[PDB]
Design a protein around this nucleic acid. Sequence first.
DNA 1: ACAGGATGTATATATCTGACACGTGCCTGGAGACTAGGGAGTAATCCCCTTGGCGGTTAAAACGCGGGGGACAGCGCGTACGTGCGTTTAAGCGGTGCTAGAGCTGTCTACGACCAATTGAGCGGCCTCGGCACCGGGATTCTCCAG
DNA 2: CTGGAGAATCCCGGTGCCGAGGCCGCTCAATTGGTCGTAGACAGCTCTAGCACCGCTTAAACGCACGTACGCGCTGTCCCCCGCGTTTTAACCGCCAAGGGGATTACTCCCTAGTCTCCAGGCACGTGTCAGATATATACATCCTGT
Lengths: 96, 96, 95, 95, 83, 88, 449, 109, 108
Amino acid sequence: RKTRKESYAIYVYKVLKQVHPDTGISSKAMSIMNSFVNDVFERIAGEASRLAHYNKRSTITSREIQTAVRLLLPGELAKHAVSEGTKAVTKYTSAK
Amino acid sequence: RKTRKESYAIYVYKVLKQVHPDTGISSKAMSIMNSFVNDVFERIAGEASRLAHYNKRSTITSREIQTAVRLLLPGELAKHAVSEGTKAVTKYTSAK
Amino acid sequence: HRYRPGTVALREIRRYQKSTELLIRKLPFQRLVREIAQDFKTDLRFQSSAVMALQEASEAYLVALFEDTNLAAIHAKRVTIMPKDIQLARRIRGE
Amino acid sequence: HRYRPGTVALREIRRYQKSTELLIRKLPFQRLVREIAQDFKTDLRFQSSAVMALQEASEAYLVALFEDTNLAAIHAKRVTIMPKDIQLARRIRGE
Amino acid sequence: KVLRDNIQGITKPAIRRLARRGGVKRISGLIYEETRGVLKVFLENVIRDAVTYTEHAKRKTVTAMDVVYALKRQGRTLYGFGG
Amino acid sequence: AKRHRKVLRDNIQGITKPAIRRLARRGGVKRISGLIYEETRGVLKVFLENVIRDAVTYTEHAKRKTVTAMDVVYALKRQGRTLYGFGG
Amino acid sequence: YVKWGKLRDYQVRGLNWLISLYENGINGILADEMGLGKTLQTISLLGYMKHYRNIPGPHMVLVPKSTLHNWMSEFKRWVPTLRSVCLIGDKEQRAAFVRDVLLPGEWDVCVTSYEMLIKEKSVFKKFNWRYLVIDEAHRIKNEKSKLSEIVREFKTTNRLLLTGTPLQNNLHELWSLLNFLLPDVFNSADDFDSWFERLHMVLRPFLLRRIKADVEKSLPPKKEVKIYVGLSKMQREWYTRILMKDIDILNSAGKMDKMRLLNILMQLRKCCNHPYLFDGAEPGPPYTTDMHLVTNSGKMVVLDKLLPKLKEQGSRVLIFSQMTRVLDILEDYCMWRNYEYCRLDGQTPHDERQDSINAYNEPNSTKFVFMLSTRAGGLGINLATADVVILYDSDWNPQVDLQAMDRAHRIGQTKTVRVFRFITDNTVEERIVERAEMKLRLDSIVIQQ
Amino acid sequence: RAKAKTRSSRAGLQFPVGRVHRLLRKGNYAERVGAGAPVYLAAVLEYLTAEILELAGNAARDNKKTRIIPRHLQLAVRNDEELNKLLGRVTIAQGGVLPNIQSVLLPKK
Amino acid sequence: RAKAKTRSSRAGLQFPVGRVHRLLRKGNYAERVGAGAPVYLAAVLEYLTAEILELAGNAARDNKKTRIIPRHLQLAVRNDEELNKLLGRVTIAQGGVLPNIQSVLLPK
DNA sequence: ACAGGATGTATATATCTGACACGTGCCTGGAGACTAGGGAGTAATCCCCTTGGCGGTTAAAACGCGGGGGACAGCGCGTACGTGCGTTTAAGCGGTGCTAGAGCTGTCTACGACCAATTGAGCGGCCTCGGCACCGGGATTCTCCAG
DNA sequence: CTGGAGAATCCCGGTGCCGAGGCCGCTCAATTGGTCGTAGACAGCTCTAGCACCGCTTAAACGCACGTACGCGCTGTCCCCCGCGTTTTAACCGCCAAGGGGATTACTCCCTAGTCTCCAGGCACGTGTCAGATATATACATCCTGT
Ligand SMILES: Nc1ncnc2c1ncn2[C@@H]1O[C@H](COP(=O)(O)OP(=O)(O)O)[C@@H](O)[C@H]1O
Ligand code: BEF
Ligand SMILES: [Mg+2]
């Protein structure tokens, strides 16, 4: 009967443990992390959408996401992030 | 040349002559008027789209555009814009 | 005994700048919110967390405006906030 | 003949407010756009209309910042604008 | 039924604690009347939109999401309430 | 020397004091301190850096070497500096 | 009627042909080879139209700025019965002359520059003109140019073009002249296309040309010498770094940053002429050394051939360049040598220009070098005294160079004129000289009538 | 088939209902668009167009011009309290500044 | 049929690649969406998450408490220049103001 | 206090020029009119969460008023402001030449969406020993004042 | 200047508790495989508009000097907050009831997208002509000076 509600909480928990193994987190701090992930997803996806319309393409791809990330993120955050994403696509395409 | 360019210019001029029969308009001013129509269109359709998503609906209808107009325009413009939209939809439905 | 004018004002700044509690009293703000809502529609009911979301947003706005207002009074070489300092801050912000 | 200090200053304010022209010279501004860009990518070419969009946007930004600077000067009871008034305007606007 | 003026329920002590979190050492007496109007104008703008959303949804109850969407439009993102 | 008669200033100096005074006069400023010319140049340069960096990101994405008027208009729009008149 | 001297037989025949154009009611082009007296042929025509047809009505002449004082002098000399007046100067001077001289109507010929016409267009359109003479008519070859539009709005009974380079780059740039003369004949360039082995058929009715090699057997022919030169080691360094586009160079620190290169061709052309044109290239911020200047440019190393020339009788010389800065470095070289010299350029004021020409041409004049910029100094001015011409640079238009050489080879030149052209051997200067020669082939210097 | 009538003519509007429908269908707003949505939106854009041109034409007339230019448009938007709220973040090119000099700055008497 | 391997395992990530792809497909961002796009976006969302939680964990240990709470998150974002530029228009609930007095107001 | 100087400003009239304004020919998005199959609406059910009931009783707000902090007007002093002069500078305009690279069309084939089918990560439910709120014991150590 | 007193949080050790991590079960979206058809990379071509240089003219900016508006340091002034204590009111907590209305699932059937076909609105095009520009002239504004 009672429907399910999706969230990022189990991924946020698994990433904390990798960063600080002994630390825990309260349910209110979880609600704020779940809000943060959704805000940043919507910002990146909105810029990636427009850039494709400007250039008259119908497909979103890793290149349009890379440009969206460079437009939205501050300078140093953008650099490290770009490296993390290009690393992940390099590993994924070796194993698809 | 060898490529057409759509604009609102003829529609802006047809309305101009109903409001002020005597006047004309410059090319610089007509380019600003085309930019105004494009900006306002993108604002109203962005709120409509979001409204549908929040309420879990697949269609944009006139009821979502009415609410987008009420969220976007200042109070005296909103009450008149809603009156003009509802008059047009009633008249259109009588001929359809 | 008596502390001097402005000494306890500094303890009050430090104490409220450590805590994260809501400062306005809850029940009185709930009556204010509902009174405003009757101008828009009659017989609205309300989720309890919808009033807490309004209070969190309202206290965050006022605290931030008081910071911009204080800068303006220091600019005018004073330490006391005046109504014209709220008006300058809102005007320069674009409100 | 000699007009008093500030008599011609009001006469210029009225002229420039009536006109709608660009006040910076076009070649000296075009040479600055090009240098700033060379840092980001090298060997770029520019449409003649693209530099005019940059100049319109730049002069609109500076004129609007000079209004906020003059209200922050008059608040401190002065008629002369100073570097500190530019800095308070940019801080209250959050930039 | 109809509520009378509760804007006097935002007390002088509560406005002073908000000025203290904002770093304010000394406060003039006329700030309180000025602050109550500033608060009322902010609440009127947020509640108006929060109710437009509820009406579109055909519901009588204002939800925490209706408030979060109203604040998100005005450039005031709030984390914590299911956003 | 005929060869060295001319001397070049930095490109920021091209925004002259006469050019800044008119902008402040359009803004309704009556009297101007002598330190404001240095301060105003610093402020414009920070504005141009933030708009140009983005206008070039758009150009690179389109794989073009020329900056267009639309690249500038989209960069200003994304920062809340909407401009009418240059298309879009 | 003509007083000071006698027209030569070809000038007589040219006058009779211009009169025959007038009586047939046609306009036409006079295009004798440079140095052949086209100006006197023109001055004599106006004398005829007054003394024999009784037409003292207003006539106009358009000229380059550097020739306004020559034309005026010749009017005063050969035919003193014409009442010539000249417009030139600041806004107040033009207003004063218009008010106090032009509008009174006490004159019969008006002489002006192309800039003075573009400024005073609304004054000159009041008058109804009897003749409109343009000189150096190649200036109006592009019909979309503002002078070309302005010039077609005038009320004129007759029109005339004087030019010794009637062909420039293409058949449309010659059609653009025919469309000023007879717009109702050459209605379109699409009609001139197709009309075109059709050699001289269209041209003979409206064009006349004679060559010095036919009509002045006494004038010595030109000698032409190409001198190929290598780059200096410094020029070889810069020419390679420019191609790589790693010039760097920044005077305000920043680890030399980068110099921008949106047009590399012009950077390569600069380098060939001298390395010092570039920023920070001259060694030592103090500067003032001069031996270093001669060495770091392969062209300047060769240019010490000026010392042989000066000792070899008075082989007085003209030096032509396309870049204003190059005349600067050549002027510092001549000052450091203690040579006697003159210089004309586009910056020069009007009064000064004619004084310089006069001082250099005097029978007892001691000036050895004249430096001329190729645009301003290459047209109209006459300098028969010098025996030698140096082209330091090479132009994309072959015809520009030809005119410059002819500043010396003209009536009154007693001696063979030598032309030296500098070319850097393994560089873009080869491609520029090849392109200019490809353009000569289609012209072919047709002798014509 | 019957002879064509534009949907704008049926609604009683000058702006284009057909173009607006295509723009919405191809802009990726929703996976479906209704039939009245393009008519309601075209009515609102024409109304807002008429509100600006009425004020701009008055500004041109007071300035003794028969032609609207970018300055007249600025004057109209900035002197209307709702249009200046709708358009508070846009820059109009060749649009001047409304004339205003603060009182303290003026000569004494 | 071979045994399944979730796309996040193939890319070496903890956040979900499959869910991100659905959210993009059904969110009206484009007509089509490529297969490398959800992998790039999931990697960036996990990096930004780890960037915050690292500094939050340190603020919790500085307060000598074992659980991260909503104030610790505010102290982290506000004390870093780039996270404060990314989150400059955000209010966080149960978030205090960083401690601060203008030096003009302090006693002599 | 206010007379003529002087200056800029406003506007009267004239002629003038170049952006607007009409209509032409042309061609490709809008409009007809059926079928398709899902979204949408409306019924009805259930039982989460909301609205005031009372009493209780702490804490918070309120009042009043002694007293010294800061707000604010005024004066005098002194140095960068503005003003206009003559001077030198290079914006602006036009013109030449050239070819980088925006733009179009054309062709061909990697890619993504789709279906059906499959089985495991992730959902909610029910759980519990340990993080840390709270109370009441003493520790310096903030600040202030009369020697 | 500064010893002293005495109100401020500040550690410390005990006491209880419902928050957070664990697991269970089992739910329903991700997985794989195959297939389809068309987005977009490639190459080619054409030709618009990027850049540079010099020439020309003269608005513009440069620096100089002059002299007085107004920047801003001290002082006196005397009002309005601060802080204390008191009394006072209304907040919080807990407890328990009725029933509005969020929510579910179910049913049915109106709505819009799809396709193809079709012909008229809208595109760019080229040209005459009239709002606009600006030239000269003057008449009326406003400011300054000195008496
Ligand atoms: N018939 C003549 N007798 C003497 N000198 C002449 C004669 N014709 C021309 N000259 C001189 O020859 C010079 C070259 O003539 P010019 O008018 O410059 O011809 P172009 O203008 O075609 O070069 C002039 O300076 C002129 O004085
Ligand atoms: F034909 Be010339 F040398 F004026
Ligand atoms: Mg001549």
